[PDB]
Amino acid sequence: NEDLRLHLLLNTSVTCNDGSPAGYYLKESRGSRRWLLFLEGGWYCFNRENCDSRYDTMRRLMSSRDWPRTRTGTGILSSQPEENPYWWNANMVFIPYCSSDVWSGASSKSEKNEYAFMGALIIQEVVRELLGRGLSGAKVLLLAGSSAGGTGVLLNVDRVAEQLEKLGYPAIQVRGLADSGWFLDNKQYRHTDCVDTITCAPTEAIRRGIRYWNGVVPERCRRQFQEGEEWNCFFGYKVYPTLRSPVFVVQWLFDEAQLTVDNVHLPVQEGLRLYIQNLGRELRHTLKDVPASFAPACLSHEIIIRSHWTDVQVKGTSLPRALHCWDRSLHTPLKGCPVHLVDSCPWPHCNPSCPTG
Ligand SMILES: *[C@@H]1O[C@H](CO)[C@@H](O)[C@H](O)[C@H]1NC(C)=O
Numbered sequence: 001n002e003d004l005r006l007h008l009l010l011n012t013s014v015t016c017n018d019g020s021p022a023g024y025y026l027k028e029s030r031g032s033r034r035w036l037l038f039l040e041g042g043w044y045c046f047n048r049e050n051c052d053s054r055y056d057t058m059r060r061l062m063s064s065r066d067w068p069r070t071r072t073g074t075g076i077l078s079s080q081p082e083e084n085p086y087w088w089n090a091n092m093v094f095i096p097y098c099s100s101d102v103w104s105g106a107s108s109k110s111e112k113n114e115y116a117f118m119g120a121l122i123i124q125e126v127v128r129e130l131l132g133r134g135l136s137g138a139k140v141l142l143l144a145g146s147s148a149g150g151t152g153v154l155l156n157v158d159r160v161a162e163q164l165e166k167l168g169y170p171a172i173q174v175r176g177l178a179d180s181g182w183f184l185d186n187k188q189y190r191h192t193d194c195v196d197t198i199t200c201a202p203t204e205a206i207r208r209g210i211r212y213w214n215g216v217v218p219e220r221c222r223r224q225f226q227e228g229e230e231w232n233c234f235f236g237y238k239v240y241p242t243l244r245s246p247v248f249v250v251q252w253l254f255d256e257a258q259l260t261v262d263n264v265h266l267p268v269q270e271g272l273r274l275y276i277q278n279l280g281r282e283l284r285h286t287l288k289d290v291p292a293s294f295a296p297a298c299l300s301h302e303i304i305i306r307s308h309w310t311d312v313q314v315k316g317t318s319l320p321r322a323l324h325c326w327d328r329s330l331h332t333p334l335k336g337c338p339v340h341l342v343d344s345c346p347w348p349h350c351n352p353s354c355p356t357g
């Protein structure tokens with residue numbers, strides 16, 4: 001089944017990196033008042049040289065010119081209850097990541113800019129165009145996303161809420177689901193000064209990206225960190241306390257992209273063993289006061305649009321169940337239907353339900 005259909009944005013000034021129109025894939029579900037808007041991930045680029053390389057060999061992440069007319073909804077975007085016990089009957093939207101800016105940008109291609117970085121405006125424009133296609137009747141809009149798209153949820157969920165309130169739709173409850181987008185600005189296992197793309201740690205790359213992209217962050221977080229320090233708001237544990245919309249956080253404790261930016265590449269000796277155990281402990285610590293969260297002790301990356309997303313469990317509860325319990329909690333804790341699920345065991349795949357690879 002190729003069930004989500006492409007719509008290029010009617011406002012063609014809201015563009016992917018190369019100026020081609022951005023867009024979204026939609027599968028409507030008549031009579032459902034639930035809307036799931038999913039933000040794709042896929043790293044980022046932060047200067048002309050590394051964006052030019054991404055344009056050669058990752059062009060679908062910078063351009064709509066070669067996008068297919070349809071995509072199959074998978075995982076949480078599946079319309080089959082067998083694959084998606086949580087929201088199989090929802091209106092489904094997949095928003096391709098073509099702005100390379102962790103969904104933060106608000107800059108057009110121009111005389112001075114080789115590329116457009118419009119991630120934050122793409123989300124706003126998708127929402128605006130969907131209102132005319134049934135979103136005006138929604139009761140819940142779940143803004144979800146994986147990897148850079150998960151960070152994109154944290155950066156944009158409150159702006160979607162503000163946008164709907166000020167367009168006159170205060171009854172739409174905006175919520176976020178951030179998958180694999182909760183990163184730590186920690187010490188690398190082996191250290192590299194930022195002199196090129198590979199050596200350059202995410203705090204510095206994001207610092208440069210914000211200026212290159214004209215990147216924007218949520219207002220309360222911006223007001224805390226102030227000018228020049230907005231990069232802090234790309235780190236979940238710093239931006240989450242500032243957010244007003246309910247946000248469910250999904251994060252593997254030993255996320256593969258976290259390990260990549262930490263220069264860890266997997267007989268593990270003591271220094272690396274301690275490094276990995278400390279990373280899991282720090283991640284667990286950052287989630288202690290996140291009431292809706294699912295954080296399994298696995299070495300993996302992304303979950304919610306994988307077809308076998310139903311398989312992993314923490315304390316005997318799967319993610320689709322936890323998300324269902326979250327919906328119920330947003331109607332005191334619920335008997336047998338938990339929403340805070342963080343593994344405490346200290347090594348990858350100490351949870352037997354971890355993805356096998
Ligand atoms: C098109 O999008 C741009 C960027 O958000 C915005 O400035 C402009 O008002 C939009 N135009 C229309 C007609 O929607």
Ligand SMILES: CC(=O)N1CCc2ccccc21
Pocket residue numbers: 041042043044102147148151183202206234235257258261
């Ligand atoms: C893979 C990815 O997307 N990463 C890794 C580090 C980071 C920091 C903020 C936002 C995104 C990302």
